[PDB]
Amino acid sequence: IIEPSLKALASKYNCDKSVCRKCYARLPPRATNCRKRKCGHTNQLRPKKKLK
Amino acid sequence: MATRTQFENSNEIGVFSKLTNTYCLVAVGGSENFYSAFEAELGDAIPIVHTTIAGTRIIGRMTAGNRRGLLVPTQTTDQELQHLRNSLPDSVKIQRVEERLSALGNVICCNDYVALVHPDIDRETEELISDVLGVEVFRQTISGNILVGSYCSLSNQGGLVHPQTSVQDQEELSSLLQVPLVAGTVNRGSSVVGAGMVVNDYLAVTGLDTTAPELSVIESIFRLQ
Amino acid sequence: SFGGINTFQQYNTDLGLGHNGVRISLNYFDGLPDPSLLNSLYSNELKLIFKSLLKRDETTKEKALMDLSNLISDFNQNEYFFNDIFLLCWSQIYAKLIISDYKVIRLQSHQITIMLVKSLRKKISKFLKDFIPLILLGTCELDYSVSKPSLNELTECFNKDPAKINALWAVFQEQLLNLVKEIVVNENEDTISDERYSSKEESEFRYHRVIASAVLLLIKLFVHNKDVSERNSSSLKVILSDESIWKLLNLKNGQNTNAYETVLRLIDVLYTRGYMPSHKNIMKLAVKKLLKSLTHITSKNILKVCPVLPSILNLLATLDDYEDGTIWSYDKSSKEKVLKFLSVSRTSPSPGFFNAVFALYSSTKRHSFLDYYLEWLPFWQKSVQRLNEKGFSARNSAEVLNEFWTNFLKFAEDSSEERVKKMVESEIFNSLSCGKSLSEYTKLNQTLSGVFPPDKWEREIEDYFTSD
Amino acid sequence: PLIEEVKLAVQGLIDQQMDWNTIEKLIKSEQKKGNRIAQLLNLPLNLKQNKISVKLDLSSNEKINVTIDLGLSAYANATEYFNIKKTSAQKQKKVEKNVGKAMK
Amino acid sequence: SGNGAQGTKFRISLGLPVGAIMNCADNSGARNLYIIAVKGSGSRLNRLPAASLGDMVMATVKKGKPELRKKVMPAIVVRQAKSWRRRDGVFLYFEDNAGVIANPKGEMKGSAITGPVGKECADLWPRVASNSGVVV
RNA sequence: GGGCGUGUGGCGUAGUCGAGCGCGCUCCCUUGCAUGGGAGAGGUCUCCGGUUCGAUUCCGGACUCGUCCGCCA
RNA sequence: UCAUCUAGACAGCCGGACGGUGGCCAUGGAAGUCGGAAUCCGCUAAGGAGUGUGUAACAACUCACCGGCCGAAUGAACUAG
Ligand SMILES: [Mg+2]
Ligand SMILES: [Zn+2]
């Protein structure tokens, strides 16, 4: 156990992201398009897979 | 205590260490836990010497030790001999042995009073053992095992011998040594008991894989309680 | 950092050994420190030490203990670290630590507690009640090595005042007894040691070792406090009723007869106290076990059990005296067991064992437990005859043979039978004839003069000169 | 509510990262020492599938053994047992539709 | 060597390539060992994997007891007979190639060793040093 | 390597979605150049999933066996 | 091509987001939120017989709607260089 607030603060940077389906890039959670050129700024995004 | 110790992963402590009543010898290339076991259990009353014999980390199989004396092979250098002479107390006598078998821990199984040797040793070496150690000597094999030092663990209180030993050989050796002997295993069933562990009057050090019934047999036969 | 709550312990509302609001128990499953309490600890360094202590591996446990000790050494720097919270936690773990198989762990744990008290003197008073019994158990343990240093240290802690040490026994007698009770009745061998990592044996061995220490503790406690029996009778009855203490007296198997000796001493103490008479049923239960013990003693293990035998016999004489060999009376086969025992005992005779046997004989004749001519005298003749074979090849046998002769002469004086005296004379001559050195056993020879009269010996010399 | 107390107790022991066999030995010892929360439990614990089993009185001396998931509420476990009841009824109706044409 | 090594080993001049037959020094009933592989050996085109003293090899019993023949087992080289240099600069060699049988962890199948063994092997394998008569 | 088909009691063998016979031998009865008769035992229908209400039976996958075609100058 | 727009639009904060009514069937329960149908009034500046989270069912939170600050364009879908 870390602490509940400290787990929230660490998960803000480590777990509450989104993943581009084409190029696996770690993206902002409210993003609409990937920031990478190689996937062509696609809008195929998924949430980052949580535990539990 | 039969103290669980490893030599960097090695569960054979008799190979890398030689323990008597008066002194202890440990290899120079040893871990902090391995040194800390002898330092905590032995205390400050008994000197612990970090030594190398003949350029080898193995010292228990190279040397045969007693409270009165220590025997070293011919290949031991003058620097190691002088370091042992300075580090050891004045009571013990260190003498080089010039003998072909040259691995005195494997050749000789000895305690304070009585010793078992390899049958084929030279007579000058037998007289040298009787002189320096002050110990009466028998040439005998443990159920056909000529390496009595590797295949027997011996102290003043009792002895552990090879597991595959004839019972008749057990009472014969027990009457010859005037101590009770038990056939048993050490280090999760390893046959080489003398290489497996070191023992004296109040301490036994063994490998970590030595199981609880084996450790109970050790403390029972060596009366360490 | 620490999570979870000990709800089950809360339902129980039992403080176990502890008087400070924390359950303290020897058993592995419970008494582990509460996570909330652990969180409360003053420093991260302490918290880690505790987590390591919880872990199963010994090397880690030792490492943590060493670290804790180092922190205590710098008390001034770490005084803030040590707090009631620390004390509550240490106490809970300390109990489990004292039962540890590894000697170093036990020794270090005891040393740490004593050090803490010395530094925190007069600040550990609330916690003293929990700690003192445990500290004492360490001071009174079958292994000399753990107990002796612990004892010396305890004395230094109290400024080397013997009175204080005795005072502890008096002041905490109720607490001490509670500890003994918990080991004997509340605990079981399985509870003490986890089954997966421990066999049926060893666990059994362990429970016995711990209980043996408890019996040892009781003996000192009884000696220290006379009224302890009266004040603690209800609890004492419970402790005695349990078969566990009685199970301890097994010589059939087991490495240490030291444990067995301790139980005998307790039974002896109980009879001397009159507590055993007070609860006759308890005395009977002990007697039955003593009878079982006789069967256990056997030729195969005679060498192993030989030092313990003289003691058994001396105790037997005292117990038999009570209620007219009432102890013998309970068992129909008591005589049968004795007969078997005698044969086994005679084959190997301990030094001083025969003196004990004569004392038993002094007791037996009054209640006529045994027929002297058919059984006692002949068995003795067999025993000396056996000794004659054992003439004196090994050490001490020489002392034992002389010892037997002293006893045998006494046996004969009681016999008042012509045949017996004649038999003695024949044996005496034969013993000399078998040979040994009179000079070597000079003291024995001086004792030996009675068998051949001084004038007879001069006549004996004339007969010897005549001999071819 | 008492099932929720038992669940909170077992989950509190789980959240201490305690070994499962030591938890079962703690349940046995508290049953021997007469703790009601311990005595409501059945000892072959399915902690591998996060499931316990609990003894409930049939009449408000016979007891029934019911399996409770630790990750759902007691009412939610009751709704699962109701759901297994409801699924069994539909299969029975399918059997009743089957019977005539099958036996013909 | 590899897994069961107790420490490292300085480079000894390689004397036993693949296909070499050495004497079987222990009392396990085997007469010779035939080397088919060396543990820890590298890869080069056309180069034979060669063994030195103290190395663990894979070997078959070509001559000996039938329950030891016709299978592969690990072995440890204890006598080399090709001269090699130590860091004190003596060039030394035995008069025959000899090895003992072991498991992959390194403990000996046999119980006693006939003839000398090298200290570079005895330091690296403790069971060999345990059952060894003379260490040079 | 690929294609096509195959898999039933100890053995052989019949199966339309609702496991029988023969052979081996279990027992009993009954007979020289040793028979016959009567009750027996014997299957996870190669295995795993879905459909059905129920698959030897329908379907999909895997295993196994048997066929056919396949490298160079 | 649809919509909104100085009579205050879209983002961002803040407040309300209600009664008839736990609307009718159906369920051991399901009260806006397991489903089947209907989907209407009042008070309104405004609030769906409910957009989600949500409980055994509740409770609770949030929505799309209206309001203060902002003062001017913005949202959705689609087409092709
Ligand atoms: Mg090539
Ligand atoms: Zn992308």
Interface residue A51 vs chain C (CB under 8 A): no
Residue B212 in tokens? 């609880």
Please indicate whether, in this complex, the C-beta atoms of D35 and C8 are within 8 angstroms of each other: yes
From residue B186, alpha-carbon distances to B160, B210, C256 in Å are 10, 5, 22
Interface residue B35 vs chain C (CB under 8 A): no
- Residue in chain B closest to C59 (alpha carbons) equals B33
Chain F nucleotides with an atom closer than 7 Å to a protein C-beta: 18, 52-54
Give yes or no for a contact between C398 and C364, defined as CB atoms under 8 angstroms apart.
no
**Bridge partners, E92 (sequence order):** E84
If 0-12 CB within 10 Å is exposed, 13-18 middle and 19+ buried, where does residue C416 land?
exposed
**Using a CB cutoff of 8 Å and minimum separation of 24, what contacts does C222-228 make?**
C222/C269, C222/C273, C223/C269, C224/C166, C224/C169, C224/C170, C224/C173, C225/C169, C225/C170, C225/C173, C228/C173, C228/C177
DSSP state of B140: -
D93: three-class secondary structure by DSSP: helix
Whose tokens are 């009353």? That residue is: B45
Say if C and D touch: at least 3 Cβ pairs within 8 Å: yes
Region of residue A18 (left: phi > 0; alpha: psi -120 to 50; beta: else): beta
For residue C396, give the amino acid letter: N
- Residue in chain C closest to D23 (alpha carbons) equals C29
From residue C15, alpha-carbon distances to B212, C85, C117, C133, C239 in Å are 33, 16, 22, 15, 19
* C-alpha closest to that of E52 among E84, E27, E25: E84
Ligand lying nearest the CA atom of residue E45: 1
CB proximity D82–strand G (7 Å threshold): yes
Query: What is the spatial distance between Cα A26 and Cα B151, in angstroms, rounded to a whole number?
Result: 63
**Bridge partners, B161 (sequence order):** B183
From residue C335, alpha-carbon distances to C14, C268, C294, C323, C414 in Å are 49, 21, 11, 17, 21
DSSP A1-52: ---HHHHHHHHHHHTS-EEETTT--EE-TT-SS-S-TTTTS---EEEPPP--
What ranges make up the beta strands (E) of C268-341?
Answer: none
Give yes or no for a contact between C308 and C316, defined as CB atoms under 8 angstroms apart.
no
Q: Which residues contact A16 (CB under 8 A, 6 or more apart)?
A: A29, A48
B interface with E, Cβ–Cβ < 8 A, is: 7-10, 12, 15-16, 29, 54-58, 61-62, 75, 100-103, 106-107, 145-147, 150, 190-192, 195
User: How close, in Å, is residue A2 to chain C by CA atoms?
Assistant: 5
What ranges make up the beta strands (E) of C5-131?
Answer: none
Ligand lying nearest the CA atom of residue E46: 1
**Bridge partners, C141 (sequence order):** none
Q: At what angle do helices C125-139 and C84-98 cross, to 10 degrees?
A: 20
Give yes or no for a contact between C23 and C30, defined as CB atoms under 8 angstroms apart.
yes
Residue B72 in tokens? 């070293």
Residue C360 in tokens? 């038993």
In terms of residues, how long is chain E? 136
Whose tokens are 């038993």? That residue is: C360
DSSP E10-54: PPPPP-B-TT-EEEE-BSSS--EEEEEEETT----TTPPP-B-TT
If 0-12 CB within 10 Å is exposed, 13-18 middle and 19+ buried, where does residue C159 land?
exposed
Segment 3-42 of chain C within 8 Å of chain A by CB: 3
B103: three-class secondary structure by DSSP: coil
Query: What is the spatial distance between Cα B47 and Cα B24, in angstroms, rounded to a whole number?
Result: 6
Query: What is the spatial distance between Cα C283 and Cα B139, in angstroms, rounded to a whole number?
Result: 56
D103: three-class secondary structure by DSSP: helix
Residue B74 in tokens? 């011919």
Query: What is the spatial distance between Cα C309 and Cα E18, in angstroms, rounded to a whole number?
Result: 69
CA-derived radius of gyration, chain C: 28
Give yes or no for a contact between B29 and E7, defined as CB atoms under 8 angstroms apart.
yes
From residue C62, alpha-carbon distances to A39, B216, C31, C420, E58 in Å are 56, 21, 20, 67, 42
Sign of CA dihedral C68, C198, D33, C36: positive
Q: Which residues on chain E are in Cβ contact (under 8 Å) with B121?
A: none
Q: Which residues on chain C are in Cβ contact (under 8 Å) with D16?
A: 3-4, 6, 32, 35
- Residue in chain C closest to A6 (alpha carbons) equals C1
Chain G nucleotides with an atom closer than 7 Å to a protein C-beta: 28-29, 55-56
Query: What is the spatial distance between Cα C444 and Cα C403, in angstroms, rounded to a whole number?
Result: 8
From residue B7, alpha-carbon distances to B10, B58, C96, C213, E129 in Å are 5, 11, 29, 35, 15
DSSP C392-456: SSSTTHHHHHHHHHHHHHHHHHHH--HHHHHHHHHHHHHHHHH---TTTTHHHHHHHTTTS-HHH
Q: Which residues on chain C are in Cβ contact (under 8 Å) with A2?
A: 1
From residue D100, alpha-carbon distances to C12, C41, C288, D93, D96 in Å are 62, 75, 78, 12, 8
Give yes or no for a contact between B1 and B218, defined as CB atoms under 8 angstroms apart.
no
Backbone phi and psi for residue E91, each to the nearest 5 degrees, phi listed first: -95, 120
Query: What is the spatial distance between Cα C462 and Cα C428, in angstroms, rounded to a whole number?
Result: 18
**Bridge partners, E98 (sequence order):** E23, E79
User: How close, in Å, is residue E61 to chain B by CA atoms?
Assistant: 24
Nucleotide nearest D99 (Cα, C1'): F53
Q: Which residues on chain C are in Cβ contact (under 8 Å) with D18?
A: 4, 32
- Nearest-5° Cα angle at B201, B199 to B206: 20
Whose tokens are 């699962």? That residue is: D80
Query: What is the spatial distance between Cα C259 and Cα C293, in angstroms, rounded to a whole number?
Result: 13
Q: How far is the CA of E74 from the centre of ligand 1 (A)?
A: 26
Backbone phi and psi for residue B18, each to the nearest 5 degrees, phi listed first: -130, 115
* C-alpha closest to that of E129 among C162, B203, C94, B106: B106
- Residue in chain B closest to C200 (alpha carbons) equals B213
Q: How far is the CA of E72 from the centre of ligand 1 (A)?
A: 24
User: Under CATH, which number does the domain E15-136 receive?
Assistant: 2.40.150.20
- Nearest-5° Cα angle at B62, B59 to B68: 85
DSSP state of D49: G
C220: three-class secondary structure by DSSP: helix
CA-derived radius of gyration, chain E: 14
CATH architecture entry for B1-225: 5-stranded Propeller (3.75)
Cβ count within 10 A of residue B38: 23
In terms of residues, how long is chain D? 104
Query: What is the spatial distance between Cα B183 and Cα B152, in angstroms, rounded to a whole number?
Result: 9
Å from the A28 CA to the G72 C1': 31
Å from the C193 CA to the F36 C1': 74
Q: Which residues on chain A are in Cβ contact (under 8 Å) with C2?
A: 1
Residue C430 CA neighbour count, 13 Å, CB half: 16
**Bridge partners, B2 (sequence order):** B204
Q: How far is the CA of A12 from the centre of ligand 2 (A)?
A: 21
Give yes or no for a contact between E88 and E11, defined as CB atoms under 8 angstroms apart.
no
Give yes or no for a contact between C38 and C47, defined as CB atoms under 8 angstroms apart.
yes
CB proximity D98–strand G (7 Å threshold): no
The H helix count followed by the E strand count for chain C is: 29, 0
CB proximity D79–strand G (7 Å threshold): yes
User: How close, in Å, is residue C4 to chain A by CA atoms?
Assistant: 10
CB proximity D102–strand F (7 Å threshold): yes
Whose tokens are 């992963």? That residue is: B9
If 0-12 CB within 10 Å is exposed, 13-18 middle and 19+ buried, where does residue B1 land?
buried
Alpha-carbon torsion, ordered E15, E18, E22, E27, to 10 deg: 120
Residue E130 in tokens? 């345990």
**Using a CB cutoff of 8 Å and minimum separation of 24, what contacts does C446-455 make?**
C447/C402, C447/C405, C447/C406, C448/C402, C448/C405, C450/C409, C451/C405, C451/C409, C451/C424, C451/C425, C452/C428
Query: What is the spatial distance between Cα C411 and Cα C380, in angstroms, rounded to a whole number?
Result: 9
The H helix count followed by the E strand count for chain E is: 2, 9
Query: What is the spatial distance between Cα C432 and Cα C445, in angstroms, rounded to a whole number?
Result: 10
Q: Which residues on chain E are in Cβ contact (under 8 Å) with B143?
A: none
DSSP B177-202: HTS-EEE--BTTTBS-HHHH-EE-SS
DSSP C282-302: HHHHHHHHHHHHHHH--STTH
If 0-12 CB within 10 Å is exposed, 13-18 middle and 19+ buried, where does residue A5 land?
exposed
Query: What is the spatial distance between Cα A30 and Cα A17, in angstroms, rounded to a whole number?
Result: 8
**Using a CB cutoff of 8 Å and minimum separation of 24, what contacts does A30-39 make?**
none
Query: What is the spatial distance between Cα B85 and Cα B70, in angstroms, rounded to a whole number?
Result: 10
Cited resolution, angstroms: 2.6
Q: How far is the CA of E45 from the centre of ligand 1 (A)?
A: 6
Backbone phi and psi for residue B165, each to the nearest 5 degrees, phi listed first: -125, 135
B175: three-class secondary structure by DSSP: helix
Query: What is the spatial distance between Cα B86 and Cα D76, in angstroms, rounded to a whole number?
Result: 79
DSSP state of E87: T
**Bridge partners, D46 (sequence order):** D51
CB proximity D98–strand F (7 Å threshold): yes
Q: Which residues on chain B are in Cβ contact (under 8 Å) with E131?
A: 106, 147, 150, 192
Method for structure elucidation: cryo-EM
Query: What is the spatial distance between Cα E108 and Cα E103, in angstroms, rounded to a whole number?
Result: 7
| Pairing outcome for strands B114-117 and B109-110 | antiparallel
Residue B110 CA neighbour count, 13 Å, CB half: 36
In terms of residues, how long is chain B? 225
Q: B touches which chains (3+ CB pairs under 8 A)? A: C, E
**Using a CB cutoff of 8 Å and minimum separation of 24, what contacts does C15-20 make?**
C16/C182, C17/C95, C17/C130, C17/C133, C17/C134, C17/C178, C17/C179, C17/C182, C18/C91, C18/C92, C18/C130, C19/C126, C19/C129, C19/C130, C19/C175, C20/C87, C20/C88, C20/C91, C20/C126, C20/C127, C20/C129, C20/C130
Q: Where are the domains of chain B?
A: 1-225
Query: What is the spatial distance between Cα C104 and Cα C50, in angstroms, rounded to a whole number?
Result: 17
Interface residue C36 vs chain D (CB under 8 A): no
DSSP C132-171: HHHHHHHHS-SSHHHHHHHHHHHHHHTTT-HHHHHHHHHH
Say if E and B touch: at least 3 Cβ pairs within 8 Å: yes
For residue C310, give the amino acid letter: P
Q: How far is the CA of E97 from the centre of ligand 1 (A)?
A: 27
C215: three-class secondary structure by DSSP: helix
| Pairing outcome for strands E98-101 and E72-79 | antiparallel
Query: What is the spatial distance between Cα C250 and Cα C270, in angstroms, rounded to a whole number?
Result: 19
Q: Which residues contact B178 (CB under 8 A, 6 or more apart)?
A: B113, B114
User: How close, in Å, is residue D39 to chain C by CA atoms?
Assistant: 12
